[PDB]
Structures are given as C-alpha cells and as structure tokens.
Amino acid sequence: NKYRFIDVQPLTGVLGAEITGVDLREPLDDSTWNEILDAFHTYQVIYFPGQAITNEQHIAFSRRFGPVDPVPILKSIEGYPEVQMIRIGDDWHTDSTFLDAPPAAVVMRAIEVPEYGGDTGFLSMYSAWETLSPTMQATIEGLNVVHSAETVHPLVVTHPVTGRRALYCNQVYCQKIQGMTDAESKSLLQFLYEHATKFDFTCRVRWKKDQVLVWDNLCTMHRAVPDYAGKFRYLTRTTVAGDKPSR
Amino acid sequence: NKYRFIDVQPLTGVLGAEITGVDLREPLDDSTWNEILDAFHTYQVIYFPGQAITNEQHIAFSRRFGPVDPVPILKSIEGYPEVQMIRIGDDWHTDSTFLDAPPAAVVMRAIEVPEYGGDTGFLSMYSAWETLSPTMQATIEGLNVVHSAETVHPLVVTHPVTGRRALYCNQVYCQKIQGMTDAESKSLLQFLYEHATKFDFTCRVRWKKDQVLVWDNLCTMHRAVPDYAGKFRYLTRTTVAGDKPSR
Amino acid sequence: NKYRFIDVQPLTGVLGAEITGVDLREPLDDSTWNEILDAFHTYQVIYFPGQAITNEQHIAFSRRFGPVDPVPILKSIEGYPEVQMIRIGDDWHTDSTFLDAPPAAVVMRAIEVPEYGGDTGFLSMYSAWETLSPTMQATIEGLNVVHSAETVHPLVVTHPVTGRRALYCNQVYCQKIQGMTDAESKSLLQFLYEHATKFDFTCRVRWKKDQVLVWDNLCTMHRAVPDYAGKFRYLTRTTVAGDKPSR
Amino acid sequence: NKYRFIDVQPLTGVLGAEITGVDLREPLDDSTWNEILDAFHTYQVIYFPGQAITNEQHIAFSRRFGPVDPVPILKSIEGYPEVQMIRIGDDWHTDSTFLDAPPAAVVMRAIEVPEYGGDTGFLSMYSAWETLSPTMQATIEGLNVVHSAETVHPLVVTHPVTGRRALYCNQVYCQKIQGMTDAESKSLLQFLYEHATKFDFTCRVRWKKDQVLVWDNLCTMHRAVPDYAGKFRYLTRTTVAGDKPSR
Numbered sequence: 001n002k003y004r005f006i007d008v009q010p011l012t013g014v015l016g017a018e019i020t021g022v023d024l025r026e027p028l029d030d031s032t033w034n035e036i037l038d039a040f041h042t043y044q045v046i047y048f049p050g051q052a053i054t055n056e057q058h059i060a061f062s063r064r065f066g067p068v069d070p071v072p073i074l075k076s077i078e079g080y081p082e083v084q085m086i087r088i089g090d091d092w093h094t095d096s097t098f099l100d101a102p103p104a105a106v107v108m109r110a111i112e113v114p115e116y117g118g119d120t121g122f123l124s125m126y127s128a129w130e131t132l133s134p135t136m137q138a139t140i141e142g143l144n145v146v147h148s149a150e151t152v153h154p155l156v157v158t159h160p161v162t163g164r165r166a167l168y169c170n171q172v173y174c175q176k177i178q179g180m181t182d183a184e185s186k187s188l189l190q191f192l193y194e195h196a197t198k199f200d201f202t203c204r205v206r207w208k209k210d211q212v213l214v215w216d217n218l219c220t221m222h223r224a225v226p227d228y229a230g231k232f233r234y235l236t237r238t239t240v241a242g243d244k245p246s247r
Numbered sequence: 248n249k250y251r252f253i254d255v256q257p258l259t260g261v262l263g264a265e266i267t268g269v270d271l272r273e274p275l276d277d278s279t280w281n282e283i284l285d286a287f288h289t290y291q292v293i294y295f296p297g298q299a300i301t302n303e304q305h306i307a308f309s310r311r312f313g314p315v316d317p318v319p320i321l322k323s324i325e326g327y328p329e330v331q332m333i334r335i336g337d338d339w340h341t342d343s344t345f346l347d348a349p350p351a352a353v354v355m356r357a358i359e360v361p362e363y364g365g366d367t368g369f370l371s372m373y374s375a376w377e378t379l380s381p382t383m384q385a386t387i388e389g390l391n392v393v394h395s396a397e398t399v400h401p402l403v404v405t406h407p408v409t410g411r412r413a414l415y416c417n418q419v420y421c422q423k424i425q426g427m428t429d430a431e432s433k434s435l436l437q438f439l440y441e442h443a444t445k446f447d448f449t450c451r452v453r454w455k456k457d458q459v460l461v462w463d464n465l466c467t468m469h470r471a472v473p474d475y476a477g478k479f480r481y482l483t484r485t486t487v488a489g490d491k492p493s494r
Numbered sequence: 495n496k497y498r499f500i501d502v503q504p505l506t507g508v509l510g511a512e513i514t515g516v517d518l519r520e521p522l523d524d525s526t527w528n529e530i531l532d533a534f535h536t537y538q539v540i541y542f543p544g545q546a547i548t549n550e551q552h553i554a555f556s557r558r559f560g561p562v563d564p565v566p567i568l569k570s571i572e573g574y575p576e577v578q579m580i581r582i583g584d585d586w587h588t589d590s591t592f593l594d595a596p597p598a599a600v601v602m603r604a605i606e607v608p609e610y611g612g613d614t615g616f617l618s619m620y621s622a623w624e625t626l627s628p629t630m631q632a633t634i635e636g637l638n639v640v641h642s643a644e645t646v647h648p649l650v651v652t653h654p655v656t657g658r659r660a661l662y663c664n665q666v667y668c669q670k671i672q673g674m675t676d677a678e679s680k681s682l683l684q685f686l687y688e689h690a691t692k693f694d695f696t697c698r699v700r701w702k703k704d705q706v707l708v709w710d711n712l713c714t715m716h717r718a719v720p721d722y723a724g725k726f727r728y729l730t731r732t733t734v735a736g737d738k739p740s741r
Numbered sequence: 742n743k744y745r746f747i748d749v750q751p752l753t754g755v756l757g758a759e760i761t762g763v764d765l766r767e768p769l770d771d772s773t774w775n776e777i778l779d780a781f782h783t784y785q786v787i788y789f790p791g792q793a794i795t796n797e798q799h800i801a802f803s804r805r806f807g808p809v810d811p812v813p814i815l816k817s818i819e820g821y822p823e824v825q826m827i828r829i830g831d832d833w834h835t836d837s838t839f840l841d842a843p844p845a846a847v848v849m850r851a852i853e854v855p856e857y858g859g860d861t862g863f864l865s866m867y868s869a870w871e872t873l874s875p876t877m878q879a880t881i882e883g884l885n886v887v888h889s890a891e892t893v894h895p896l897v898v899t900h901p902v903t904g905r906r907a908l909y910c911n912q913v914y915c916q917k918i919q920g921m922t923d924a925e926s927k928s929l930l931q932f933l934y935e936h937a938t939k940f941d942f943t944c945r946v947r948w949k950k951d952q953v954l955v956w957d958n959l960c961t962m963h964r965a966v967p968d969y970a971g972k973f974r975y976l977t978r979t980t981v982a983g984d985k986p987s988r
C-alpha cells in the first residue's frame with residue numbers, strides 16, 4: 001500500500017484494517033500520525049496488535065482523535081474517569097445515538113482476553129447506503145429518525161471529516177421515523193436493518209492482548225459475540241466526542 | 248341525502264352505494280344522469296338492483312360513461328363484441344393495469360346468480376392513500392411502478408375527473424418499483440398492499456339478478472370470492488375506456 | 495333451506511345468516527328453538543332484524559343459550575348488571591380470551607344505530623383452520639398460546655357442542671406460543687393471523703334498529719369498523735358463559 | 742488443546758479451526774490422521790495454511806475422507822476430472838443438495854488468491870438447530886423439504902458419523918416444505934433462514950496461497966464474498982461423497 005511510516009494489512013475489501021510498525025507507547029510525528037488518521041478514515045475501523053500501553057498513554061492517544069469524554073454509566077476505572085471498562089449490545093448498533101451529539105469514535109484496548117471467541121464484529125454503513133439503488137437513496141434522503149433510551153437524527157448522515165454519506169439507523173436505539181405511523185416506520189427500518197446486516201458488509205475482529213482498536217461511531221455498527229461463556233474478557237475504553245450528526 | 252331524482256343507500260362510510268328509483272330501460276334526462284354520475288364519483292362503486300335491461304341497453308348505458316372498448320381475451324357474447332361474459336382474480340387488483348391506458352370503469356350486469364355467495368368485494372384506493380401519514384405520502388409521491396402480464400404507471404395517481412389522489416398499485420400486475428432493486432421494491436409494495444387490503448377500507452357486494460353495477464377502475468380494487476363452488480354464476484360486462492393514468 | 499319454523503337467509507357461503515319469521519318478544523317452543531340453535535351452530539353468527547324486545551326479554555333470550563355472566567368492566571345498565579352497553583377492538587379478536595374460561599357467545603342488541611356505517615365484521619376460525627394444509631394442521635395441532643391483559647389455551651380448540659376444530663389465536667390478547675422464543679412465536683402467529691384475516695373468510699354485518707345478533711365467541715373473530723365518526727351508535731349486550739376451551 | 746500430533750487454533754467458539762504442524766505432502770499415520778478427522782468433526786470446517794501440494798496429493802488427501810466424485814458441471818482441470826476449478830452462491834447455501842445423495846464434504850485448495858478480500862464465510866447448522874427452543878425443535882422435527890435445480894430431504898438431519906442433529910435447509914435449492922402450501926412453506930423457511938444466518942453462528946475464512954480447507958457439506962452452510970472485483974482468485978476443489986441425508 002501507499003503508506004511509508006506504518007504497515008497496514010486490510011481485513012476485508014469493505015472495512016477494517018490492521019496496523020503495525022509503530023510503538024504506541026512513544027509519541028508519533030505529524031507524518032506518522034497523518035498516516036494513522038488517513039487510514040482510520042478509509043478503513044473505518046483499525047487495530048494495533050501488541051501495544052502494551054498505560055491508561056495515561058491510552059488517554060493521550062485517544063485525545064489525538066478528539067476530546068475525550070466520559071460516558072455517564074459504564075464504570076470508569078477509579079483514578080481515570082475517562083477510561084471505562086468492559087467485562088446488552090449483541091444486537092448490531094452504534095453507540096449512544098440517543099444523544100443530541102453521539103461519540104465520533106471509541107478507542108478500545110485489550111487487557112485480559114480469551115485465546116479464541118469473544119470476537120467483535122463491525123459493519124460499514126457507508127457501504128449500506130452505498131448499495132441502495134439511486135432511486136431508494138432519493139426516497140429516504142430527507143427522512144428523520146427518533147432515537148431514545150430522546151432525540152432526532154437524520155436517516156442518512158454526511159461524515160463531518162470525509163463527506164461520505166452513511167446510512168444512520170440502529171435497532172437498539174431507534175423508535176421510529178418521524179412523521180410516520182408505526183406500521184409504516186417499522187416496515188422501512190426493518191428493511192433497512194435486514195439490508196445493512198448483510199454479511200458482505202461485515203468484518204470480524206479477533207481479540208489479542210494489548211491490542212488497541214479504534215472504530216468510527218458514525219459510519220459503522222458493531223456487535224458483541226456471546227461465544228466465550230466461561231472465559232474472562234477484560235477490555236478498557238475511552239470515548240471521543242463528535243458533533244451532532246447531520247445531512 | 249342531497250339527491251332529488253334517485254334514491255341512494257350508501258353501503259359503508261368509505262365506499263359503495265345502492266341506487267333505486269330509476270328505470271334503466273328508459274332514457275334518463277340530464278338532471279337524473281347528472282345525479283347518477285355525481286354519485287359514482289363520490290361512492291366509487293354503484294349498483295342498481297332489479298334492472299331487467301338488454302344488452303343493447305347495457306351498451307348505451309355504459310356509453311354514457313365513456314367510450315366502450317372490448318378487452319381482447321374474455322369472450323364477448325357473439326353478436327355483441329363489446330359485451331363480454333363471466334362464469335385468476337381472487338387476489339385484489341384493478342383491471343388490465345398493464346395497459347398504457349387501462350379502463351376508466353366497468354359496468355357489470357347480473358344474468359343468473361346464486362341465492363347467496365359469490366359476492367364481490369371492493370376497496371377504496373382514495374382511502375388507502377388518504378390514511379398514509381403526510382410524511383409517507385411525500386416519501387412515495389414521485390415513485391413509479393412497472394405493470395406487466397408491459398408499462399409504467401405512477402404509484403400515486405390523480406383522478407382525471409375528480410382530482411383526488413389515489414394510491415395505484417396491485418399485486419397481480421405490478422412487477423416492481425422502477426429504479427429499485429427487488430429486495431427494495433418488494434419491501435414497499437408489500438407494506439402498501441398489506442396496508443390497502445385492510446378491512447376498514449373495504450365493502451362487499453351482494454349479487455342479485457338483473458343488478459347492474461359500476462365500479463371505478465382507477466381508484467378501487469376488487470376481488471372475486473370463491474364461496475359458490477357448485478352453483479351457477481353468469482354475469483356480463485362492458486368496459487369503458489380511460490386516459491393514461493397520471494400524477 | 496331445510497327449516498320449517500324460521501326463515502333463514504345466509505349472508506355468505508362461509509359464515510353468518512339472517513333470521514326472520516319469529517317474534518322474539520314471545521316465548522318459543524322446542525322445535526322453533528331447536529331450529530334457532532341448529533342455525534347458530536352452522537352459521538356461527540346470526541341476527542334477527544326488527545326485534546323490539548326489552549332488557550328482561552334480552553336476558554331470558556340469552557339464557558336459553560347458556561348462563562349469563564356479567565363481564566367485570568364494560569358498564570352495565572344500572573338496574574341490569576348482566577346487560578352491558580357499548581357507545582380498543584378495531585383489531586380482529588375474540589372476546590376476553592385471557593380468561594381460564596372465556597364467553598361461549600355474546601348476544602348483542604341494537605338500540606340507536608346510524609343509517610349506514612358502523613358495521614361489524616366477523617370471520618370464521620373453523621374456516622381458518624380448515625384451509626391449512628393437512629401437514630400444517632399436524633405441525634401446530636399440539637401447540638399452546640399464552641393469552642393476557644394471564645392464562646394458556648390451545649392453539650387449535652375443539653368446539654364443545656359441535657366438535658369442529660377451530661384455530662384459536664388473536665393478536666389483541668395472545669403474548670406468545672408457550673415454550674418458543676419470541677422470534678419464533680412471532681413468526682408463526684403473524685402467519686396465522688395474516689392467514690385467518692383473509693377476506694374470503696369474512697362477513698360484514700349491517701346494523702339496523704332493534705336487530706338482535708348472536709355470535710359464537712370460540713370459533714369466530716370480530717372487529718369494529720371506525721367509519722361512523724360523528725354519528726351516535728348505542729347497542730347493548732349480555733354475555734353467555736362457556737367452559738374452558740380445549741383440544 | 743487435547744491434541745499431540747497437530748497444532749490446532751480455533752477460529753471462533755462456534756465453528757472453524759486452523760491446523761499446522763503437519764506436512765500435507767507426506768503420508769500421515771493413523772494417530773495423526775485420527776486427530777485431523779477428530780478435529781474436522783468438532784470444528785466442522787478446517788484449514789491448513791501453506792501446504793504446497795500437488796493435484797495427485799490433493800486427491801489422495803481427499804480420498805482419506807471418503808470416495809471422490811466429480812460433480813458434473815464445474816470444469817475439471819483436464820488431466821484430473823475429480824479436481825475441479827473455481828475463478829451464483831453469494832447466497833448462503835450448502836452444496837448440491839438437490840441430489841438424492843449430496844456431498845459429505847469438499848476439499849478446497851488455494852492456487853492464486855488476492856492479498857485480501859475474497860474471504861469465504863461459513864456457518865454452523867448444528868448451532869442453528871441447537872438454538873431453537875425445545876418446543877420449536879419438536880414442531881418441525883418431522884417435516885420434509887423439496888430441493889431442486891429434484892428430491893426430498895428432511896428438515897432436520899442426523900449426522901452419519903457424529904449423531905448431532907443439524908438443521909438442513911437452504912434458500913438456493915429448497916422449493917418448499919412438502920405438504921404445505923407456499924404461503925405456509927415460505928413463512929417457516931424464511932424464519933429458519935433469518936434465524937440460521939445470524940452472525941453469532943458464523944465465521945470467516947481468510948484465504949492465503951496453498952491453504953487447503955475442508956468443510957462438512959451436511960452441517961454447515963457457506964457463501965462467497967464479492968469484495969475482490971478486479972483481483973485474480975484461483976482455487977481448486979475435489980468433492981467427497983456422502984450417503985443420503987437422514988433423520
């Protein structure tokens with residue numbers, strides 16, 4: 001690939017990629033960082049295996065992407081209220097979309113994982129949008145969705161940095177399409193979900209100790225796999241803030 | 248009701264009505280005819296019980312509504328190729344919509360019917376449209392459907408005489424929504440059909456000898472009931488022509 | 495028809511019928527009553543037009559069918575707590591199926607109705623069962639449904655008097671199929687409901703003053719039509735009790 | 742793991758695994774082979790990376806599993822009519838199920854692959870069955886499916902070697918459930934397919950040169966990913982025969 005400061009091993013031909021040849025415990029210069037971010041924007045989700053960093057180093061790193069909020073809930077490691085831990089989102093979703101302004105991204109970090117199982121699967125909502133017929137794109141271009149646990153977001157959002165359109169709806173937080181009856185709203189959204197969760201649009205992340213991963217919370221969805229029952233899974237994550245999604 | 252030359256007994260509060268106090272075998276004057284037609288346009292389907300007319304009288308009558316085509320197929324009574332007889336449309340549909348210009352209306356006439364069973368059920372596609380949320384109306388306003396057995400018609404049509412919008416799609420003749428993929432097209436149309444065939448939008452016509460009925464082939468659908476197996480059902484019908492449906 | 499003491503005018507070829515030639519204000523002898531009941535069992539729903547009876551006469555009449563319970567809720571005419579009045583069941587259903595022992599039947603009586611609209615539609619759940627393939631009948635023969643507002647009933651019930659099998663489920667009161675997951679339960683029941691609410695299985699009752707109607711609450715469903723907004727509709731009904739439904 | 746002659750790196754906690762520490766170009770002894778096969782039966786799909794074998798060696802290897810048929814169609818490398826090549830099954834399916842006796846297994850072998858993309862995804866039909874409620878298992882235990890391009894197979898099959906029950910239906914070859922109407926058959930199968938193609942039941946195989954993979958054609962399904970457009974993908978495969986599937 002066209003990348004001189006980082007090695008870059010794409011996971012599928014649709015999203016996801018792996019990054020090596022960089023010590024995350026050290027500071028990185030503009031041209032190394034310009035590459036890391038240029039990658040994250042093209043692949044949508046990126047991971048860095050065998051990065052034995054510290055929580056302070058975890059924060060700084062996240063901050064490079066954008067301001068570092070705590071999510072209220074979750075339990076932050078006491079000492080680091082920006083760094084929160086993980087040990088129901090086995091339905092595909094993206095995170096905290098009931099917020100006027102949900103997270104741009106999240107950076108996740110493997111502490112103690114199982115040998116196998118406890119994968120995380122992601123999918124591309126650029127792709128989901130992108131595979132709708134021009135006629136269907138037009139038909140729902142201007143619709144809005146009500147997300148809750150309360151707010152409204154557009155059904156198709158433009159990425160603030162990259163300007164690609166991405167379909168934006170998820171079954172965990174989306175009540176209905178504003179202005180439609182429920183029979184109507186249900187009808188569409190179900191189609192749109194059965195369409196986005198196709199296997200062609202997905203990828204699967206294998207979890208290995210001190211791997212550090214970043215996903216774009218606007219233009220992907222993701223889901224936990226429950227195939228580890230019995231085995232300890234302990235990861236941490238910081239949350240980076242984004243503007244209000246828009247069309 | 249507000250009707251001085253014809254008695255008028257509405258079947259439901261959504262469509263359909265019954266008309267008496269008029270000898271169909273005689274000619275009718277402007278103000279009697281102005282009423283018959285003013286009714287047909289409000290009720291969408293009308294019937295006239297115990298009208299022992301002749302096929303010539305059947306034609307003239309139809310012609311009052313508009314030019315009288317034969318449908319190729321069907322079998323016309325030999326002697327009257329405009330008058331065709333009846334003895335698969337047990338799915339709801341409207342007639343011959345695969346035509347660049349389908350029938351405006353049809354006039355049907357009971358020769359030998361059963362005592363009961365062999366009803367005909369109709370429904371209102373004004374109502375179907377009318378009960379869609381303003382937001383959903385807008386969402387599909389500008390879509391087109393491909394009808395076959397080949398042509399395109401709009402998904403929402405304006406009535407040429409009355410100017411009411413009416414949803415216009417049917418599962419017997421409609422392949423798909425132009426420009427959409429089949430998974431997409433299927434999704435909508437199924438909703439739209441499951442929505443239009445609601446019981447609230449329907450009515451049911453009881454068939455009795457020398458009853459003469461007229462239905463509006465643009466803004467209704469209709470379906471045969473198969474509950475007469477064993478009993479003779481013989482009706483005739485002329486077909487009145489309409490312009491190309493439009494939005 | 496084969497009926498010497500009552501005139502009997504079947505509404506469709508699937509269910510429903512009309513009964514005249516009997517003064518309901520008078521007592522009726524075994525052979526007249528033997529006919530009324532022999533009809534109710536074949537047609538599933540029966541009506542008697544222009545019966546200007548009294549509430550006491552309404553009770554006695556109902557009692558001929560079976561014991562006369564009050565439903566708690568509903569509002570009984572004060573003076574007659576067995577006689578309850580009517581002025582959400584616009585979804586098809588049958589009545590009070592959340593009871594260990596729901597009503598066998600109900601007798602309804604028209605006080606002040608509109609000229610048209612405010613029909614009541616019924617359907618046959620004998621027919622619904624009856625049109626399932628032998629293979630599908632077998633597949634769900636032994637299933638149970640959980641009904642609530644709490645109890646279990648079989649999915650296919652045998653009529654206590656007639657011994658015809660009837661499909662027995664309804665979307666207003668049925669939570670799920672016992673033992674199945676919700677994705678599973680949903681799947682079937684939706685099919686079974688989309689199948690039973692077909693138009694071929696239905697009929698529609700026209701409501702006229704002092705008409706008195708009886709429906710079989712085990713083997714039909716029924717639904718109110720909302721096409722009278724603005725017009726006064728006042729009917730009364732007594733409720734006749736039935737055993738626990740069984741297979 | 743409990744394996745002394747082969748190294749064994751499970752792909753997910755549901756199916757699939759990777760096998761190293763064995764030169765496939767050499768013969769292997771009972772206890773090494775007893776392990777390879779004991780693995781294939783537990784993981785359902787297995788792969789061997791960086792095995793630069795020959796087509797004769799490819800055949801012998803396959804034969805160890807069972808007799809080696811050609812599939813008519815496909816194009817066999819001229820010189821080896823048992824060894825067939827690959828360069829519509831982007832719907833999930835299993836192979837040639839329209840046969841009275843479909844393939845037990847297939848062995849596939851990577852010649853020239855892309856750097857990334859052109860993955861193959863598999864899923865477990867043990868798991869699919871296994872996650873149905875006991876009540877639903879019972880409900881469809883005894884059903885049959887008609888497969889075509891013509892034959893009948895059971896909807897739930899017992900594995901001839903292992904004796905685990907596995908759900909057995911696929912949307913590419915299955916017409917309908919025998920004895921049911923199409924509305925009925927459609928209803929179930931759609932549920933069963935929407936249920937089996939869940940992400941939790943899947944895995945994804947990364948393709949790398951001279952990797953040799955074996956999948957169990959009775960108890961998995963699999964699907965091609967179209968994310969390589971432009972890049973050369975050339976694999977070969979032999980096909981191993983199985984008895985008629987049974988319950």
Ligand SMILES: O=C(O)CCC(=O)C(=O)O
Nearest residue numbers: 086089095120222223224
């Ligand atoms: O726990 C994981 O694997 C990530 C899944 C998730 O739902 C989240 O926190 O966004």
Ligand SMILES: O=C(O)CCC(=O)C(=O)O
Nearest residue numbers: 333336342367469470471
């Ligand atoms: O035969 C009838 O009852 C009318 C039904 C019909 O499909 C038609 O000719 O349009």
Ligand SMILES: O=C(O)CCC(=O)C(=O)O
Nearest residue numbers: 580583589614716717718
């Ligand atoms: O009010 C009616 O028309 C009868 C409908 C109904 O839901 C009932 O009381 O069972």
Ligand SMILES: O=C(O)CCC(=O)C(=O)O
Nearest residue numbers: 827830836861963964965
């Ligand atoms: O070509 C592949 O990736 C295997 C997919 C397939 O459909 C097959 O041959 O069974």
Ligand SMILES: [Co+2]
Nearest residue numbers: 005006007021
């Ligand atoms: Co390098």
Ligand SMILES: [Co+2]
Nearest residue numbers: 023025026027
């Ligand atoms: Co340093």
Ligand SMILES: [Co+2]
Nearest residue numbers: 009018020049
């Ligand atoms: Co690596």
Ligand SMILES: [Co+2]
Nearest residue numbers: 054055056057
């Ligand atoms: Co420290």
Ligand SMILES: [Co+2]
Nearest residue numbers: 066067068069
């Ligand atoms: Co900050």
Ligand SMILES: [Co+2]
Nearest residue numbers: 088089090091
């Ligand atoms: Co869940």
Ligand SMILES: [Co+2]
Nearest residue numbers: 099100150151
């Ligand atoms: Co707010």
Ligand SMILES: [Co+2]
Nearest residue numbers: 176181182183
């Ligand atoms: Co609501």
Ligand SMILES: [Co+2]
Nearest residue numbers: 194195931935
């Ligand atoms: Co689907």
Ligand SMILES: [Co+2]
Nearest residue numbers: 193194197935
């Ligand atoms: Co889904």
Ligand SMILES: [Co+2]
Nearest residue numbers: 252253254268
């Ligand atoms: Co008059």
Ligand SMILES: [Co+2]
Nearest residue numbers: 270272273274
């Ligand atoms: Co004259």
